[PDB]
């Protein structure tokens, strides 16, 4: 519910698309288990697709810890200080690949209600409307029922 949740306006981080686009994803940290049925998708993701992902985008630092865990996880850290943690528990390799690509695609801004899906900083070019726009003037600026 919108009345029961926060909200924000549509925005960029540092005017991303104005000059050069920069990848907002900074780090991906993977907790995967040596043994354990829940870390099998993560195990094969590390086997095959983590190297190609790192080669594909070199602005992201990827760590893989390989520690005993019941729930494998991925923590995404973004240039604006945002931290997001996701569970890759009992997920297929395609699911994990879609998840990490989505993480690399998003920015660090909060995923909440967006409030008017456009952000213009110069909404008016010919001048914002005021009650005197589209209103003609009078001689000597004489208001109604005046004398001189």
């Amino acid at each position: 519910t919108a009345r029961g949740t926060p909200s924000r306006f549509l925005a960029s981080v540092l005017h991303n698309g104005l000059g050069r686009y920069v990848q907002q994803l900074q780090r991906l940290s993977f907790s995967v288990s040596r043994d354990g049925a829940s870390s099998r998708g993560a195990r094969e993701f590390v086997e095959r697709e983590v190297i190609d992902f790192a080669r594909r985008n070199p602005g992201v630092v990827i760590y893989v810890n390989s520690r005993p865990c019941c729930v494998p996880r991925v923590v995404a850290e973004y240039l604006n200080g945002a931290v997001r943690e996701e569970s890759i528990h009992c997920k297929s390799v395609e699911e994990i690949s879609t998840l990490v690509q989505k993480l690399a695609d998003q920015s660090g801004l909060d995923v909440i209600r967006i409030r008017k899906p456009f952000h213009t900083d110069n909404p008016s070019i010919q001048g914002q409307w005021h009650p005197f726009t589209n209103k003609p003037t009078t001689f000597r600026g004489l208001r109604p029922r005046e004398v001189q």
């Binding site: 695609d105 209600r113 899906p117 213009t120 110069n122 070019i125």
Partner: protein, 156 residues
């Protein structure tokens, strides 16, 4: 066919006389020439456009952001030409399409800046005294486009 003046003899609205077609054609030619020379000299700054995109019309200008509610099969950082421009206006003049402006006239550019999902949207169904209760949560895909430039060409 003569009627004395009364309150109903003549229609209340004023009588309108539209201009003669050939002189109006010459006037249109000179007005288009003046607007075209303003374009060639560069007598405009910070113009806006109305662009049909993803079933919607967007009043865009340069430097701003647009959120569209689906995927686009583009990478982040990809530059894209936004066709289907139906209005483009600068200070002191405006160009309209019927219904779209020409390809050679306007050129709107937009870069893909963020591919994400929306916040969860609740879909709850309830009927009283019927044990009827259902609940969904949906997160729709979303793309953020930054409009980089809107150029105009003298081909008017």
């Amino acid at each position: 066919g003569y009627v004395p003046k009364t309150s109903l003899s003549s229609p209340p609205w004023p009588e309108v006389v539209l201009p003669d077609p050939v002189e109006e054609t010459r006037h249109h030619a000179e007005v288009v020439k003046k607007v075209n020379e303003m374009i060639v000299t560069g007598q405009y700054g910070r113009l806006f456009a109305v662009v049909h995109f993803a079933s919607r019309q967007w009043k865009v200008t340069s430097e701003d952001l647009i959120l569209i509610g689906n995927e686009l099969d583009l990478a982040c950082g990809e530059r894209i030409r936004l066709e289907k421009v139906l209005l483009v206006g600068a200070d002191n003049f405006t160009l309209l399409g019927k219904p779209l402006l020409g390809k050679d006239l306007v050129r709107v550019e937009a870069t893909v800046i963020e591919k994400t999902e929306s916040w969860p949207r609740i879909i709850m169904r309830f009927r009283k005294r019927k044990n009827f209760k259902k609940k969904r949560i949906v997160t729709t895909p979303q793309t953020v486009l930054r409009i980089n430039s809107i150029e105009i060409a003298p081909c008017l």
